């Protein structure tokens, strides 16, 4: 069967960090559900791009388990993700089903807010490092993409493709990842 | 007075090639208007991401001349752009007034369809090369970003950041482009 991905879209999310993973995962054959945190209404992102979610998080959650839960960045987007009790529960569940959790840029700070994957090696956008490392609950990494167990993190808009292809490789293998990468004309 | 950019969004447009330029240009302080080719309603992109345009092309056209008209890629998207009389008019008038025109991936084929910038050196996605060179109305290039006067083209999803920064540099200068690039965590 097809692998499934849940991308949580919160108001203020970084649109590039949301669209790149969604697009690349879909090119890999992954079934992606763009779930709106606040609901089914269109979501205005960090740079005002408005994206219509496939479903509300409320409805998306009750829709079977996901092979990966993706948390885009964006300062306001990550803030919203961090304050959501719904997201807290979702991430906790993913940890227990031993499911992959991927967060990029400011997104990893949501993991800290919901006490997810403590002790793991993680990376974030440089400007989110101090926030993420407050309390020393993680080991920081400078890698553009860092994968420690079922905790996958990345640094920013510029590492979005690497971040997405890493997710693809973790879910569909190196071959599928290479196939999806070729047509993108990356560096 | 902030520079202005018109991004024409048609059904089937490559969402990454749409969002990255919009986001990056807005980071540079450029007033961007995402104009829906078919109207104000949400647009379903190539990998099913649904984007809500800021306005219809009809309304956007009325809002003063733009410093740049951007054409995203996406096979169906570029085709729709290429078959649009509205787009033909916008592009012809932009060229006549010495206004920048930027197209990426399959997007440049809309330039061929509307006989825009003949004689210019251009690039496209490798898969759109034959289509673009049909008739030999341009000189082909393999540069990730190609700028020949007021015709700026790029190759694909993976060159979207370079494409957007090239637009930013052409409109606001190398310094603004550098300041916008720094926080992205690119190569």
User: Cα–Cα distance between B45 and A27 in angstroms, integer?
Assistant: 13
CB B102 within 8 A of CB B165: no
Method: X-ray
Whose structure tokens read 């400078």?
A142
Q: What angle do CA A161, B76, B70 make, to 5 degrees?
A: 65
Q: Which residues of A touch B26 (CB under 8 A)?
A: 47-48
Structure tokens at A177: 């990842």
Q: Which of A95, A89, A77, A97 is nearest to A37 (CA)?
A: A77
First-residue to last-residue Cα distance in chain A:
32
CB B89 within 8 A of CB B110: no
**CATH of the domain spanning A1-187:** 3.40.50.880
Which chain A residues touch B if contact means CB-CB below 8 Å?
A: 14-16, 19-20, 22-23, 26-27, 34, 42, 46-52, 54, 125-127, 144, 155-159, 161, 183-187
Cβ B155–A185 below 8 Å, yes or no?
yes
Which H or E run includes B69? strand B68-71
CB B61 within 8 A of CB B1: no
Q: What is the three-state SS of B91-160?
A: HHHHHHCCCEEEEECCCCHHHHHCCCCCCCEECCCHHHHHHHCCCCCCEECCCCEEEECCEEEECCHHHH
Given A45, A52, A105, A137, the catalytic residue: A105
User: Cα–Cα distance between B81 and B71 in angstroms, integer?
Assistant: 8
Structure tokens at B128: 């759109």
Resolution rounded to one decimal, in angstroms: 1.7
User: Cα–Cα distance between B101 and B50 in angstroms, integer?
Assistant: 25
DSSP string across A107-144: THHHHHHTT-STT-EE---GGGHHHHTTTS-SEE--SS
CA torsion through residues A34, B183, A155, A179, sign: positive
Beta bridge partners of A120: none
Buried b / exposed e over A33-62, threshold 16 CB at 10 Å, is bbbbbeeeebbbbbbebbbbbbbebeebbe
Q: Which of A16, A126, A183 sits opposite B23 (nearest CB)?
A: A16
């Amino acid at each position: 069967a097809s692998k499934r991905a849940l991308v949580i879209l919160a108001k203020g999310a970084e649109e590039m960090e949301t669209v790149i993973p969604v697009d690349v995962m879909r090119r890999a054959g992954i079934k992606v559900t763009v779930a709106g945190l606040a609901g089914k209404d269109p979501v205005q992102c960090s740079r005002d791009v408005v994206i219509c979610p496939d479903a509300s998080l409320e409805d998306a959650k009750k829709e079977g388990p996901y092979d990966v839960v993706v948390l885009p960045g964006g300062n306001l987007g990550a803030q919203n993700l961090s304050e959501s009790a719904a997201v807290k529960e979702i991430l906790k569940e993913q940890e227990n089903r031993k499911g992959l959790i991927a967060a990029i840029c400011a997104g990893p700070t949501a993991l800290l807010a919901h006490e997810i994957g403590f002790g793991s090696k993680v990376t974030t956008h440089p400007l989110a490092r101090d926030k993420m490392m407050n309390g020393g609950h993680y080991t920081y990494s400078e890698n553009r993409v860092e994968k420690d167990g079922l905790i996958l993190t990345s640094r920013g808009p510029g590492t979005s493709f690497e971040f997405a292809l890493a997710i693809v490789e973790a879910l569909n293998g190196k071959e599928v990842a290479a196939q999806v990468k070729a047509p993108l004309v990356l560096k």
